[PDB]
Amino acid sequence: MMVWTPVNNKMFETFSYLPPLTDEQIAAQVDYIVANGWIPCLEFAEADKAYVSNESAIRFGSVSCLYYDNRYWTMWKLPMFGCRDPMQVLREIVACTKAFPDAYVRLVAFDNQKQVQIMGFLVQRPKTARDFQPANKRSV
Amino acid sequence: MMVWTPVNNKMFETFSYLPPLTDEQIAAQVDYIVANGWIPCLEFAEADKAYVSNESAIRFGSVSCLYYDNRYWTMWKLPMFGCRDPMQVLREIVACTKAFPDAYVRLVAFDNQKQVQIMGFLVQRPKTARDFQPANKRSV
Amino acid sequence: AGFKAGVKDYRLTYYTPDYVVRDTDILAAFRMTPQPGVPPEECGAAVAAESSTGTWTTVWTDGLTSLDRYKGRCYDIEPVPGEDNQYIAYVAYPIDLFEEGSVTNMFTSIVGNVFGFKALRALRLEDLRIPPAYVKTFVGPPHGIQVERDKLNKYGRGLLGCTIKPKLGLSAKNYGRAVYECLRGGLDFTKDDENVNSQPFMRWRDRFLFVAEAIYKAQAETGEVKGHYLNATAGTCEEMMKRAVCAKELGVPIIMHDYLTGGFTANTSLAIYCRDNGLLLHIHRAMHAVIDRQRNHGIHFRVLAKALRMSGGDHLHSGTAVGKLEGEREVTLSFVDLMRDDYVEKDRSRGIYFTQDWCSMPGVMPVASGGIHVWHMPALVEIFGDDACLQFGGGTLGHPWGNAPGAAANRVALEACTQARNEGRDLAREGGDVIRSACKWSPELAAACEVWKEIKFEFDTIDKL
Amino acid sequence: AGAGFKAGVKDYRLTYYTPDYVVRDTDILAAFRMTPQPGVPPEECGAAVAAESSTGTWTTVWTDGLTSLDRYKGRCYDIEPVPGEDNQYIAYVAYPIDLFEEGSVTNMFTSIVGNVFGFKALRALRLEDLRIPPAYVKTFVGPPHGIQVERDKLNKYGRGLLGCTIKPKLGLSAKNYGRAVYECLRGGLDFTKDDENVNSQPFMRWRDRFLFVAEAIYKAQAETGEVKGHYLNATAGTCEEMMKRAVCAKELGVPIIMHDYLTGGFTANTSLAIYCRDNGLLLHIHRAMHAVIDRQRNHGIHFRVLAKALRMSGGDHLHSGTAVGKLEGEREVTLSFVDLMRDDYVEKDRSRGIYFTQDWCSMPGVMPVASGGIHVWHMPALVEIFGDDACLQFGGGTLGHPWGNAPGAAANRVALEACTQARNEGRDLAREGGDVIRSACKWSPELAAACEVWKEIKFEFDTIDKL
Amino acid sequence: IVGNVFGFKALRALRLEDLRIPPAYVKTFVGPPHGIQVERDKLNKYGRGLLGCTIKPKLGLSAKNYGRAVYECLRGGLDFTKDDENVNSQPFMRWRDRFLFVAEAIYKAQAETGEVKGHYLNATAGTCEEMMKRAVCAKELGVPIIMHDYLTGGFTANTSLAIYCRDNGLLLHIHRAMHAVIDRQRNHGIHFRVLAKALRMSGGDHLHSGTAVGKLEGEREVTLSFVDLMRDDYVEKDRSRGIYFTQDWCSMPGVMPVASGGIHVWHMPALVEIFGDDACLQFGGGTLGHPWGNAPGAAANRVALEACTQARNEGRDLAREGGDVIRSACKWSPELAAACEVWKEIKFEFDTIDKL
Amino acid sequence: AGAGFKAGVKDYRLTYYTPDYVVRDTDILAAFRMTPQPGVPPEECGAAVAAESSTGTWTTVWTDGLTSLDRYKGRCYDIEPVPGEDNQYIAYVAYPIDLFEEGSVTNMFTSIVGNVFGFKALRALRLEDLRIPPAYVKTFVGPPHGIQVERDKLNKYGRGLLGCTIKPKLGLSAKNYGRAVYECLRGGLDFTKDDENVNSQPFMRWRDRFLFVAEAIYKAQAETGEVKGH
Ligand SMILES: O=C(O)[C@@](O)(COP(=O)(O)O)[C@H](O)[C@H](O)COP(=O)(O)O
Ligand SMILES: O=C(O)[C@@](O)(COP(=O)(O)O)[C@H](O)[C@H](O)COP(=O)(O)O
Ligand SMILES: O=C(O)[C@@](O)(COP(=O)(O)O)[C@H](O)[C@H](O)COP(=O)(O)O
Ligand SMILES: [Mg+2]
Ligand SMILES: [Mg+2]
Ligand SMILES: [Mg+2]
Ligand SMILES: [Mg+2]
């Protein structure tokens, strides 16, 4: 029996339980966005704004249900409407991460027919982050 | 008259007011578990998650009565159902504390007829903890 | 068979010694002392009649219904050994006679009028068999022992409490000051005295606020959950509920109620409020000894304890055996089992007249309180085991070094006795050694041991089995 | 240093036995009949009772120094040996008014009788009397209406009121209950009532009963031209249920409800009395369970205290006992209850068991109710004991009449009116009562039938609760 | 439509197969409190199926043990846990005690993982007043989601609860307890496709759809018809699928299908292929039966789901390559390997009763 | 080593088929007519029904060890082959009273008939009977009045009561509904009634119907001198 660690083991939604995505694996996900005609977009957040929190609820009556702070991140530029070139997406990942090297950065895509985000995963975490585990240290 | 110190004098429920349990004393408590057919289990927590707190109540209406955070700790493996060997319990104490040397660790036991925890005491605190007193410094 | 006006013997209708009791009948065991010249069969029949369907003369309206279906039945009478004029009369009552969920109604029938009958010299209700079909009509205790321990995160030892003293006369601010000092030293609970409600010297809402401050201070200081039983006992149901609502709104864990002086109707309402709002409910048995002390007349506490478990309470005072108030060891243990356990077998040697099946109704935590101190700790742990609250009022606030050292003394004593038991020591034989060793280790405990070393409460027992 | 904190046990009498204390006019006073254990001096026993019903516990506490024990302590101020007893004493205790919650009978009992009856150091304890001072009396709402207002609302003057408990106690359907009620009321009874244990049950649910009883009340009232009522039982398992029952009675426009104050309890009773005041309902109080507490001479609480408590908590009627019926209650003691519950001022009289002068400061009087095993032959004795301001209840004495309820009611009504007329004419009911009934049984066939069935029936037994 | 006609002497059997609910009638319904898009947006969860788990044993656990199990499941990677359909309020565990301990567990797991967590707290009750009290407690605890057994509680209570959830921002998971009493046999009753339409109208954010591969009956093509009828805006008549009428939902929100019952890690590729991302996949026994406990059980399921999702995104055919995807994942993840080993031989393959 | 947690699937019958069990007077009992799939033994089918309607699922869970499965499990305690059917059995299941929410028919159905009718391992299942023990019956408020009280409120004795559903089922206006009701009641019926599907609809809104029906009831009652209702 191995024990799943509760300490410094924060996750990041889709694909966070897999090995870190290689450049090839990221490129494949971008190909999937383009093949399905979805709208790519990048979003980012400083470390203090990265994970859901409750702070604004101090202002509320009994209406906290499904309210959390830090669900919204900050948009990098605009969603890439009409983009059918995976290389353009990859270039924006580079541009965003270069501009904000200490930020969390996620790649997302939108479906305008369902009007919902249809995919998303983390592409950068700050080098100073110590609240997560490499795959081989998630259990002990 | 001696004065009971209010500063850095945190306790840990059952047996915290006695001298620290020797290896022999811990062994005797394990014998008591086994003699009574109770189910041993280990639980652990990082320092920030060790003592009761109120933080989640920010999300509540007027329903905080007997709600506290940090009552649940994290289970080490599973409860030791069917265990009748005190040496197996002691070995798991060593394994738990080895894996989590900076965590608080407590030994507990369950009675499945009452369906309640029927014993429990702390077996490890972090070496960095400065919020408790040795027995002879509890009063001044 | 038609209507004949006039008086006839109760025994012609209400003495049925060949009756086979049904598993849904409520049974009563009465210790009855007939007037001279009144046959025990007629007395038992009268008790059965006047607590169920009958009166002193024949009524025509019986014919519209079925007396066979509804009558109470005296089904057995046994003479009491060593008594020339005492009998145990057993009465069976059909379940249809009772309002569902109402302890009030059950008492009104069984003990309403029969104790005043000229034809008897004395009457005592010794026991009641509450059948599962009637037990299931009650909400019962708001939480019960397991849930209470789980909410408090407290396991592996008795709980420790303390009544603030002087009983009356402290201000709200001084009340909270005393509470904080007690709790911070190692007590789990403090409590309002039974008679602390709202008074000129201290109004309730002021007390509740200062006590909340004290609870939260001690909890933050010790890292252990703390509570104080805030008294909701009041002159009216509306006032009682206001007090419960304030406790809810302060987020505190526990309130208390004096179930006999407030009464069963209020108590049951309060227990339902506590269930619905997550408050623990400590029950104080103030006035019980008016009713339950004497062997020849009244109602034995075993019945009053069953009634409370039905009406609802998370804790109930049980007596101590060794303290300032009366209650012998074996009788105390009978209360403990009847209030905690799911099933208690008939055992006449214990004063248990009927097998009692609780059909999974939660257990009530027994509370030992009244003139107890550190030297009693091994006996208390031996009697009650872990599932009890042991309360030291004078035994904490009478410590020469003050409340926090007083609390620490009690906590060390309890933990030392618990550890010794777990290690295999026999507290009944080695308890003295266990407490003595502890008094030699802890300065706080040593100070308590010295003050109370000679203090014992040893008197002839009135309520003997 | 002055007087400081000294840990440890000392005698209660050092603080709580104050034989030179002069009682204040605002003190609550208690008279306890105390039976100490061998080797415990009466002064110490009395002091212990005073201590543990007020401010003290078994060992000295430091917190006393933060307040003023002189201001708050209960005080045993007098102890008298009991004539004829070697080990019984009357201990008198004075409690400052500050100890008590205003308007709360629950609180007053919690102090005075809460714990002390269980002390190992005593063998037996009985609370005999309480002196409730006007300054405390004035904190209570008290009875919803009281005797004068009740008579004025009912338009009933110049005789005792007549009632009747429906029987069998349990087992009748709602419709049969109303049938019995109508037949009783139409024959000349003012009231009928639910038995104390009739609440809501499988054989008859309360709301069904209330509706059929309403029909019966209004039928009998229209038939007779006299105001009628039936005490509908609000006694219930919870306050919410009790209140639902009172609200239904209000909504039916009926005059009166009842409550079992001891089995329901003081907190519920006080709430119900307040509701009745606010909604104009009369409140009949049944004392079910009182004899569990009040029967024995050596231990418990005397009914005179339980009666004072009820007057404070609130009720328009209260059962007083009959002297002559099936339940115990000697004539002189019954009269003491009558005076304590009806009158504005009752002087101390040890020969009557009245230990303190009781001033009610204009709190309304409660109507005594004589009930239990009484029949027509008792009528002269009842009228002589109670006079007009009482309700006399005949359950078996009405529903046991050989011709049924209406003739049974008429028999009781004729008997009552015959005794009242005789009284008014200057006849001595104590001496001429037998003649009055005999003359009436000869005139009224309904009464004659009752007289014949119950001629030989008496309830004469050794009295347990002797003064 | 179904009140009396099924009992007529003149017929031997009668089954309602389908209903065409026209837009003009659809528009008279409040419908689902939130629906799929709003639910994902509130939970901040995109790009994969959601993962849940029914606590077991069904009955008999204390409130504290319930919360303990919930925390351990959620902290390992499940999005949701849930009360069993029959967990309401009982002697062994009263509802309010459960709600409080579950709240503690939800908030602990959410803090530990950094992902939004929930537990479907059962509001199903004996009376509407009791049901509403339970919903109100969930509101006052600030928790995301409650559940209701729509058929055993009934449509009148369900519609009321859905309106409450709309008004107070609670997600509403719907359990279809009792449906197979009605919907199993081909000759008599009401087909589940009608019961699903009815639920979408009465209101629910999630509805159990069947699994195809698990312990309860529901063939793949029929399951897909339920999924489309509950999620989509417009479903064309298709007799080959048992869809007798074109159904136009006129923008009524879609209900999230929930696949539950006897499923485990080996079923993951088939489930992802059937449902795609817009479903909740629930593993009760498949989590609490993991040899290492709940957190490793949850992690195993989460790894399996993510591995299948990644593979699909990369262009792999899960219908043909699913076994390879799971095998590769079991080799990488010790938690998953342990699950794979225990349930390798376990399948549920029986003759189908409810054939089209 | 005592009995501990062993992960994996085992037969339901090992835990939930208990043919020697003596039913308690507080147990809820169920009689299920079951038709197993070929190759599934009746003991295993009965055990599966017992398990999945009480405490069990498809694989062993570790949490069982924290409680007492003996105390809580449903138990298939008898199986009877059915008269003239090769593959049909009556399975008898006993449920501890602790499994049920007091006063809730909803809860009782949720356990006993919630999921088991959909199991792949059975071809068909019918719940034939339930023994509701007195200790559970007493937790229900039950009928508002019942037969005796109804007769007493209506003042009707000595014959069956007579009623009548208004027709056509749907399509009458509120005024025509009351017209029909009055004419029915006045001729000697005790009751009339709304059809089951008459609720509130475009052709007749409920409150309009309730008012006209009230007028009709009171007119017929006054005319006949007998209590009427709708
Ligand atoms: O008022 C009192 O005397 C106490 O506060 C004890 O004080 P100490 O701790 O200072 O003695 C308790 O209420 C009694 O023990 C109740 O008696 P019981 O438990 O028998 O009902
Ligand atoms: O239950 C009964 O016995 C009565 O209804 C009387 O019935 P009968 O009229 O048929 O005797 C009364 O409640 C008792 O008198 C109460 O006693 P008390 O007044 O002493 O409190
Ligand atoms: O009670 C149960 O069996 C479950 O909790 C699954 O448990 P496991 O995950 O342990 O199998 C679900 O309620 C059923 O799947 C419902 O069936 P459906 O989805 O067909 O309505
Ligand atoms: Mg006290
Ligand atoms: Mg009576
Ligand atoms: Mg389920
Ligand atoms: Mg019809």
Side-chain angles (χ1 to χ4, degrees), chain A residues 38-72:
Chain A
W38 296 322
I39 307 149
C41 194
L42 285 148
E43 304 179 317
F44 64 101
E46 67 180 289
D48 289 357
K49 302 291 169 185
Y51 300 101
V52 287
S53 58
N54 297 322
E55 65 268 13
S56 293
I58 197 180
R59 296 187 62 81
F60 294 172
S62 304
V63 293
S64 70
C65 286
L66 281 164
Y67 181 91
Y68 311 93
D69 296 294
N70 298 338
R71 291 181 291 194
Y72 287 123

Coordinates of all heavy atoms in Angstrom, one line a residue, chain A residues 38-72:
Chain A
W38 N -12.1 24.8 -32.7 CA -12.3 25.5 -31.4 C -11.4 26.8 -31.4 O -10.4 26.9 -32.1 CB -12.1 24.6 -30.3 CG -13.1 23.5 -30.2 CD1 -14.4 23.6 -30.6 CD2 -12.9 22.2 -29.8 NE1 -15.1 22.4 -30.4 CE2 -14.2 21.5 -29.9 CE3 -11.8 21.5 -29.3 CZ2 -14.3 20.1 -29.6 CZ3 -12.0 20.1 -29.0 CH2 -13.2 19.5 -29.1
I39 N -11.7 27.7 -30.4 CA -11.0 28.9 -30.3 C -10.0 28.9 -29.2 O -10.3 28.9 -28.0 CB -12.0 30.1 -30.0 CG1 -13.2 30.1 -31.1 CG2 -11.3 31.4 -30.0 CD1 -14.5 30.6 -30.5
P40 N -8.7 28.9 -29.6 CA -7.7 28.9 -28.5 C -7.5 30.2 -27.8 O -7.8 31.3 -28.4 CB -6.4 28.6 -29.3 CG -6.8 28.3 -30.7 CD -8.1 29.0 -30.9
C41 N -7.2 30.1 -26.5 CA -6.9 31.3 -25.7 C -5.9 31.0 -24.6 O -5.9 29.8 -24.1 CB -8.2 31.8 -25.1 SG -8.1 33.5 -24.4
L42 N -5.1 31.9 -24.2 CA -4.3 31.8 -23.0 C -4.8 32.6 -21.9 O -5.3 33.7 -22.1 CB -2.8 32.2 -23.4 CG -2.1 31.1 -24.2 CD1 -1.1 31.8 -25.1 CD2 -1.4 30.1 -23.3
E43 N -4.6 32.1 -20.7 CA -5.0 32.9 -19.5 C -3.9 32.7 -18.4 O -3.2 31.7 -18.5 CB -6.3 32.3 -18.9 CG -7.5 32.4 -19.8 CD -8.7 31.8 -19.1 OE1 -8.7 30.8 -18.4 OE2 -9.8 32.4 -19.3
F44 N -3.7 33.7 -17.6 CA -2.6 33.6 -16.6 C -3.0 34.2 -15.3 O -3.9 35.0 -15.2 CB -1.3 34.2 -17.2 CG -1.4 35.7 -17.5 CD1 -0.9 36.6 -16.6 CD2 -2.1 36.1 -18.6 CE1 -1.0 38.0 -16.9 CE2 -2.2 37.5 -18.9 CZ -1.7 38.4 -18.0
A45 N -2.2 33.9 -14.2 CA -2.5 34.4 -12.9 C -1.2 34.4 -12.1 O -0.4 33.5 -12.1 CB -3.5 33.6 -12.2
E46 N -1.0 35.4 -11.2 CA 0.1 35.4 -10.2 C -0.3 34.3 -9.2 O -1.4 33.9 -9.1 CB 0.3 36.7 -9.6 CG -0.9 37.2 -8.7 CD -0.6 38.6 -8.1 OE1 0.3 38.6 -7.2 OE2 -1.2 39.6 -8.5
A47 N 0.7 33.8 -8.5 CA 0.6 32.7 -7.5 C -0.6 32.9 -6.5 O -1.3 31.9 -6.3 CB 1.9 32.4 -6.8
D48 N -0.7 34.1 -6.0 CA -1.7 34.4 -5.0 C -3.2 34.3 -5.6 O -4.1 34.3 -4.8 CB -1.5 35.7 -4.3 CG -0.3 35.7 -3.4 OD1 0.3 34.6 -3.2 OD2 0.0 36.7 -2.8
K49 N -3.3 34.3 -6.9 CA -4.6 34.3 -7.6 C -4.9 33.1 -8.4 O -5.8 33.0 -9.2 CB -4.7 35.6 -8.5 CG -4.4 36.9 -7.9 CD -5.6 37.3 -7.0 CE -5.3 38.5 -6.1 NZ -6.4 38.7 -5.2
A50 N -4.1 32.0 -8.1 CA -4.1 30.8 -8.9 C -5.2 29.8 -8.5 O -5.8 29.2 -9.4 CB -2.7 30.2 -9.0
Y51 N -5.4 29.6 -7.2 CA -6.3 28.6 -6.7 C -7.6 29.2 -6.1 O -7.5 30.2 -5.5 CB -5.6 27.7 -5.7 CG -4.4 26.9 -6.1 CD1 -3.1 27.4 -5.8 CD2 -4.5 25.7 -6.9 CE1 -2.0 26.7 -6.2 CE2 -3.4 25.0 -7.3 CZ -2.1 25.5 -6.9 OH -1.0 24.9 -7.3
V52 N -8.7 28.5 -6.3 CA -9.9 29.0 -5.7 C -9.8 29.4 -4.2 O -9.1 28.7 -3.5 CB -11.1 28.0 -5.9 CG1 -11.6 28.0 -7.3 CG2 -10.8 26.6 -5.4
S53 N -10.5 30.4 -3.9 CA -10.5 30.9 -2.5 C -11.9 31.4 -2.1 O -12.8 31.5 -3.0 CB -9.4 31.9 -2.2 OG -9.5 33.0 -3.1
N54 N -12.0 31.9 -0.9 CA -13.3 32.2 -0.3 C -13.4 33.7 0.1 O -14.4 34.1 0.7 CB -13.7 31.4 0.9 CG -13.8 29.9 0.6 OD1 -14.3 29.5 -0.5 ND2 -13.3 29.1 1.5
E55 N -12.4 34.5 -0.1 CA -12.3 35.7 0.7 C -13.4 36.7 0.5 O -13.8 37.4 1.5 CB -10.9 36.5 0.4 CG -10.7 37.0 -1.0 CD -10.0 36.0 -1.8 OE1 -9.9 34.8 -1.4 OE2 -9.6 36.4 -2.9
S56 N -14.0 36.8 -0.7 CA -15.1 37.8 -0.9 C -16.3 37.4 -0.2 O -17.2 38.3 0.0 CB -15.4 37.9 -2.4 OG -14.2 38.5 -3.1
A57 N -16.5 36.2 0.3 CA -17.7 35.8 1.0 C -17.9 36.5 2.3 O -19.0 36.4 2.9 CB -17.7 34.2 1.1
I58 N -16.8 37.1 2.8 CA -17.0 38.0 4.0 C -18.1 39.0 3.8 O -18.7 39.5 4.8 CB -15.6 38.6 4.4 CG1 -15.7 39.1 5.9 CG2 -15.2 39.7 3.4 CD1 -14.4 39.7 6.3
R59 N -18.3 39.4 2.6 CA -19.3 40.5 2.2 C -20.7 39.9 2.0 O -21.6 40.7 1.8 CB -18.9 41.2 0.9 CG -17.5 41.9 1.0 CD -17.2 42.7 -0.2 NE -18.2 43.8 -0.4 CZ -18.2 44.9 0.2 NH1 -17.3 45.3 1.1 NH2 -19.2 45.8 -0.1
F60 N -20.9 38.6 2.1 CA -22.1 38.0 1.7 C -23.1 37.7 2.9 O -22.7 37.5 4.0 CB -21.9 36.6 1.0 CG -21.2 36.7 -0.3 CD1 -20.8 35.5 -0.8 CD2 -20.9 37.9 -0.9 CE1 -20.1 35.4 -2.0 CE2 -20.2 37.9 -2.1 CZ -19.8 36.6 -2.7
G61 N -24.4 37.6 2.5 CA -25.3 36.8 3.3 C -25.2 35.4 3.0 O -24.1 34.9 2.6
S62 N -26.2 34.6 3.1 CA -26.1 33.1 2.9 C -26.2 32.7 1.4 O -27.0 31.9 1.0 CB -27.2 32.4 3.7 OG -27.2 32.7 5.0
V63 N -25.3 33.3 0.6 CA -25.4 33.1 -0.8 C -24.0 32.6 -1.4 O -23.7 32.9 -2.6 CB -25.8 34.4 -1.6 CG1 -27.3 34.6 -1.3 CG2 -25.0 35.6 -1.3
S64 N -23.2 32.0 -0.6 CA -21.9 31.5 -1.1 C -22.0 30.3 -2.0 O -21.0 30.0 -2.7 CB -21.0 31.2 0.1 OG -21.4 30.0 0.8
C65 N -23.1 29.6 -2.1 CA -23.2 28.4 -2.9 C -22.6 28.7 -4.3 O -23.1 29.6 -5.0 CB -24.6 27.9 -3.0 SG -25.2 27.0 -1.5
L66 N -21.6 27.9 -4.7 CA -21.0 27.9 -6.0 C -20.4 29.3 -6.4 O -20.2 29.6 -7.6 CB -21.8 27.3 -7.1 CG -21.8 25.8 -7.0 CD1 -22.9 25.2 -7.8 CD2 -20.4 25.3 -7.5
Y67 N -20.0 30.0 -5.3 CA -19.2 31.2 -5.5 C -17.8 30.9 -5.0 O -17.6 30.4 -3.8 CB -19.8 32.4 -4.7 CG -18.9 33.6 -4.9 CD1 -19.1 34.5 -5.9 CD2 -17.7 33.8 -4.1 CE1 -18.2 35.6 -6.1 CE2 -16.8 34.8 -4.3 CZ -17.1 35.7 -5.3 OH -16.2 36.8 -5.5
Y68 N -16.8 31.2 -5.8 CA -15.4 31.1 -5.4 C -14.7 32.2 -6.1 O -15.0 32.6 -7.2 CB -14.8 29.7 -5.8 CG -15.6 28.5 -5.4 CD1 -16.5 27.9 -6.3 CD2 -15.5 28.0 -4.1 CE1 -17.3 26.8 -5.9 CE2 -16.3 26.9 -3.7 CZ -17.1 26.3 -4.7 OH -17.9 25.2 -4.4
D69 N -13.7 32.8 -5.4 CA -12.7 33.7 -6.0 C -11.7 32.9 -6.8 O -11.4 31.7 -6.4 CB -12.0 34.6 -5.0 CG -13.0 35.5 -4.2 OD1 -13.6 36.4 -4.9 OD2 -13.2 35.3 -3.0
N70 N -11.0 33.5 -7.7 CA -9.9 33.0 -8.5 C -10.2 31.9 -9.5 O -9.3 31.2 -10.1 CB -8.7 32.4 -7.6 CG -8.1 33.5 -6.7 OD1 -8.2 34.7 -6.9 ND2 -7.5 33.1 -5.6
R71 N -11.5 31.8 -9.9 CA -11.9 31.0 -11.0 C -11.5 31.8 -12.3 O -10.9 31.2 -13.2 CB -13.4 30.7 -11.0 CG -13.8 29.8 -9.9 CD -15.2 29.5 -10.0 NE -15.9 30.7 -9.7 CZ -17.2 30.8 -9.4 NH1 -18.0 29.7 -9.4 NH2 -17.8 32.0 -9.1
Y72 N -11.8 33.0 -12.4 CA -11.3 33.9 -13.4 C -9.8 34.1 -13.3 O -9.3 34.5 -12.2 CB -12.0 35.3 -13.5 CG -13.5 35.3 -14.0 CD1 -14.5 35.7 -13.2 CD2 -13.8 34.8 -15.2 CE1 -15.8 35.7 -13.6 CE2 -15.1 34.7 -15.7 CZ -16.1 35.2 -14.8 OH -17.4 35.2 -15.3

